[PDB]
Amino acid sequence: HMSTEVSEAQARRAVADIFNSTLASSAIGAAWELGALDELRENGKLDVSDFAVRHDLHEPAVVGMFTALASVGIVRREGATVVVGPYFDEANHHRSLFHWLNQGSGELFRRMPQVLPNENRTGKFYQLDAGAISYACREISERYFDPAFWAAVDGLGYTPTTVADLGSGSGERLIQIARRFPGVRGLGVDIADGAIAMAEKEVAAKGFGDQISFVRGDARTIDQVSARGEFAEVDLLTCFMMGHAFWPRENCVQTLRKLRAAFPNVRRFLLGDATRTVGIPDRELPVFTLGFEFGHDMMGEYLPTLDEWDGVFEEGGWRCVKKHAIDSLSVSVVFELE
Amino acid sequence: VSEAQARRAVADIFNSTLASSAIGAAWELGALDELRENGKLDVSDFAVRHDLHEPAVVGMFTALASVGIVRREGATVVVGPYFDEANHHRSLFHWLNQGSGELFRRMPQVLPNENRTGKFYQLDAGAISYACREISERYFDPAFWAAVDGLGYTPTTVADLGSGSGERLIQIARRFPGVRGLGVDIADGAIAMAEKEVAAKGFGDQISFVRGDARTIDQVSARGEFAEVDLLTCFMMGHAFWPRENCVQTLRKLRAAFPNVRRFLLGDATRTVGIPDRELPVFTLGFEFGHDMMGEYLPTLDEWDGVFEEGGWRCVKKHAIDSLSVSVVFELE
Numbered sequence A: 001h002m003s004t005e006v007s008e009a010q011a012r013r014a015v016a017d018i019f020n021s022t023l024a025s026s027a028i029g030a031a032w033e034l035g036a037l038d039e040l041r042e043n044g045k046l047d048v049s050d051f052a053v054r055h056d057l058h059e060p061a062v063v064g065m066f067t068a069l070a071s072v073g074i075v076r077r078e079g080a081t082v083v084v085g086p087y088f089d090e091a092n093h094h095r096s097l098f099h100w101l102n103q104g105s106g107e108l109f110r111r112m113p114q115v116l117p118n119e120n121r122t123g124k125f126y127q128l129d130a131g132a133i134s135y136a137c138r139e140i141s142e143r144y145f146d147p148a149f150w151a152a153v154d155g156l157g158y159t160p161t162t163v164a165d166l167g168s169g170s171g172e173r174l175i176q177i178a179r180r181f182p183g184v185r186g187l188g189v190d191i192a193d194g195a196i197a198m199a200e201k202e203v204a205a206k207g208f209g210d211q212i213s214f215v216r217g218d219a220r221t222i223d224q225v226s227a228r229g230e231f232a233e234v235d236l237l238t239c240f241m242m243g244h245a246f247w248p249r250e251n252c253v254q255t256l257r258k259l260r261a262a263f264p265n266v267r268r269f270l271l272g273d274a275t276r277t278v279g280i281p282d283r284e285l286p287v288f289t290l291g292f293e294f295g296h297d298m299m300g301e302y303l304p305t306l307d308e309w310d311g312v313f314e315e316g317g318w319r320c321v322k323k324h325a326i327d328s329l330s331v332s333v334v335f336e337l338e
Numbered sequence B: 001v002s003e004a005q006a007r008r009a010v011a012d013i014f015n016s017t018l019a020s021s022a023i024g025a026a027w028e029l030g031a032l033d034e035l036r037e038n039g040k041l042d043v044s045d046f047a048v049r050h051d052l053h054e055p056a057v058v059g060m061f062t063a064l065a066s067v068g069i070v071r072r073e074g075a076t077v078v079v080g081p082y083f084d085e086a087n088h089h090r091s092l093f094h095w096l097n098q099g100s101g102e103l104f105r106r107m108p109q110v111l112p113n114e115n116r117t118g119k120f121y122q123l124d125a126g127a128i129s130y131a132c133r134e135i136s137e138r139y140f141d142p143a144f145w146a147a148v149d150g151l152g153y154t155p156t157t158v159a160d161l162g163s164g165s166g167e168r169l170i171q172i173a174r175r176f177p178g179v180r181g182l183g184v185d186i187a188d189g190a191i192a193m194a195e196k197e198v199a200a201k202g203f204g205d206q207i208s209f210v211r212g213d214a215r216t217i218d219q220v221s222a223r224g225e226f227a228e229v230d231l232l233t234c235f236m237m238g239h240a241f242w243p244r245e246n247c248v249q250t251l252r253k254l255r256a257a258f259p260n261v262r263r264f265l266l267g268d269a270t271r272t273v274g275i276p277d278r279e280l281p282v283f284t285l286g287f288e289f290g291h292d293m294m295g296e297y298l299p300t301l302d303e304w305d306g307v308f309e310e311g312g313w314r315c316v317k318k319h320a321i322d323s324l325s326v327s328v329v330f331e332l333e
């Protein structure tokens, strides 16, 4: 029961499940993106031809997708219908982690044997699908970081007037703050013009054109940023799912110091990220963990543990006054700093 | 059923994705063979010898460990309870991930009818070739050689369709000295590979290669050598002759292009029918699903049994294959 030694028939079944999990795993992401996981969540079942027709999909491949999900118990096939399976709720809950792993990071993991050799580790030595990462990170943010984020907003003690968001992405965080604090002004800062664009768009659509603005920027050197005339007035800083990019340490320490000086009227800084775990046994790794850590190690990108964050704030010029543990995203955390 | 049980199963599915990809890697990088011989290895020592980035190598092995293929004990890796089974099928994992990963990854863009024109999917052909060499050897060789052992004649000229690396023709030359060999492959890369391998081993006089599409074998020129062939072989590509009406015509063209062929050995994997979803063996789902995504017909065994006579051939022997979905070698004449 998880740590054993086995029959030939058992080893056969297990290896086959590894193989099929691979296709299932890729199908969870795709089934989310194509609208099937929603239809099933709402209705508990669906008709595959009907689905393939309504969405104008090559139907043999659609059968293949459901059969892959059925092979490991996420769904159950019955004649022409697919019904939710025993593992539906949990796989649907984590679907964006599957999307992230496959649709987003698949190239990296597939090219494992070209990535690992030193001779190869320079220049553009791996490729991520940026638009798929985005798509997934949008739901990861909402689904995993929202409770703690909102709790931290609730503990602010004050009402912000001007909020800065580092790595703003979709701009959805700034928009929901806008909804929460009528008459606040918001300022996103991403490194990706693609994200800038989608945000300006997503904002205009919601009618927060006057409230919210963005800017191409590298938050690790916030000082060398055209637009730092609006920073002085900001009283709330946020930074979610990008913080590990401040690292390695002395760069994080400097970035934190630069951030302290650049935003001297910031009262609260809210910083959320996933972190590198320690000492979890191989056969008990939960969803996400392995992918996040291994991927970062393949890319050569540093990932701090939680103690590495805790031990850096003072030197960086900030005090941690509240900490929230995140549910179900490896070991992830929100810090409330001042 | 049980929230604890569902969490575990879903985490195993997620980690399985990373282990699957790592099997193919462990194989290609030399780790599986080192664990096969010694039953253990040292990650630091391993990483040093092969000039690998050590943290990525740790992760590679942790992925394997997460699903019981290996066990980690400090900086040292031991064979796990599922090591023999997975090492045995390693080439199928390589095919699925290193070879075909980009197809499955792009399922949301591949399924929509609207995108299904032109070059709508990509495979890594070099990766595929690499896996197919072992798949050929490991799953097909025994039936291949039982068919050779039982031909009822010694061949003088053999042609191999989809000759690939040329390895089949080389082994036939080793068994049958002074047999003449001829490989047909549609890919310039396979031809050049095979040509190098053949000349390198000293088989330059005996075996040649010609680029061509076996589906239209009637248009391939080989300076009248096809008339001389008395044994024909075709492994792991036959499903490409389908759909049905296409296959009939292709089989009739092979019959005309090779009029002195006595036996035609045809080995392939086939589409299965009625396997319950939770009991699907290794390979099956990936073969079937990937061809349905690529828009390529995959026949069942019965479909094949039923096309041969219309195709101008008579099936005289049939060998069931071990442990590659439902695979087969037909001997036709």
Ligand SMILES: Nc1ncnc2c1ncn2[C@@H]1O[C@H](CSCC[C@H](N)C(=O)O)[C@@H](O)[C@H]1O
Binding pocket: A137, A138, A141, A166, A167, A168, A169, A170, A171, A172, A173, A189, A190, A191, A192, A195, A217, A218, A219, A220, A239, A240, A241, A242, A245
């Ligand atoms: N050094 C840097 N400076 C600014 N943005 C960065 C960055 N490193 C990464 N990013 C951005 O950080 C984002 C990661 S996704 C985070 C999305 C957002 N915080 C949310 O919770 O919804 C991407 O938009 C990426 O371009």
Ligand SMILES: Nc1ncnc2c1ncn2[C@@H]1O[C@H](CSCC[C@H](N)C(=O)O)[C@@H](O)[C@H]1O
Binding pocket: B132, B133, B136, B161, B162, B163, B164, B165, B168, B184, B185, B186, B187, B190, B212, B213, B214, B215, B234, B235, B236, B237, B240
């Ligand atoms: N229509 C066709 N005509 C000729 N060769 C083909 C083909 N379709 C695929 N192939 C070739 O068939 C090979 C499939 S891999 C098969 C390898 C070989 N028969 C063996 O047993 O090892 C590839 O080299 C590919 O280029």
Ligand SMILES: O=C(O)[C@@H](O)[C@H](O)c1ccccc1
Binding pocket: A133, A137, A140, A241, A242, A273, A274
């Ligand atoms: O390391 C990253 O930045 C990406 O992997 C991705 O944007 C992400 C960040 C944080 C949590 C989850 C995903």
Ligand SMILES: O=C(O)[C@@H](O)[C@H](O)c1ccccc1
Binding pocket: B132, B135, B236, B237, B268, B269
């Ligand atoms: O279908 C193909 O041609 C490939 O998927 C692969 O070469 C293969 C064929 C037959 C059996 C096993 C693998």
Ligand SMILES: O=C(O)[C@H](O)Cc1ccccc1
Binding pocket: A309, A310, A311, A313, A320, A321, A322, A323, A335
């Ligand atoms: O030192 C720590 O563990 C956290 O970074 C922050 C913290 C410290 C004290 C009280 C609350 C939070």
Ligand SMILES: O=C(O)[C@H](O)Cc1ccccc1
Binding pocket: B304, B305, B306, B308, B315, B316, B317, B318, B330
């Ligand atoms: O019908 C079949 O089984 C196969 O096509 C081949 C076969 C038939 C009869 C005797 C031997 C082989």
Ligand SMILES: [Ca+2]
Binding pocket: A073, A074, A075, A076, A085, A086, B278
């Ligand atoms: Ca089931």
Ligand SMILES: [Ca+2]
Binding pocket: B040, B041, B042, B076
């Ligand atoms: Ca050792």
Ligand SMILES: [Ca+2]
Binding pocket: B211, B212, B213, B216, B219, B220
């Ligand atoms: Ca031709």
Ligand SMILES: [Ca+2]
Binding pocket: A012, A013, A016, B279, B280, B281, B282
């Ligand atoms: Ca089995």
Ligand SMILES: [Fe+3]
Binding pocket: B239, B240, B291, B296
């Ligand atoms: Fe094929």
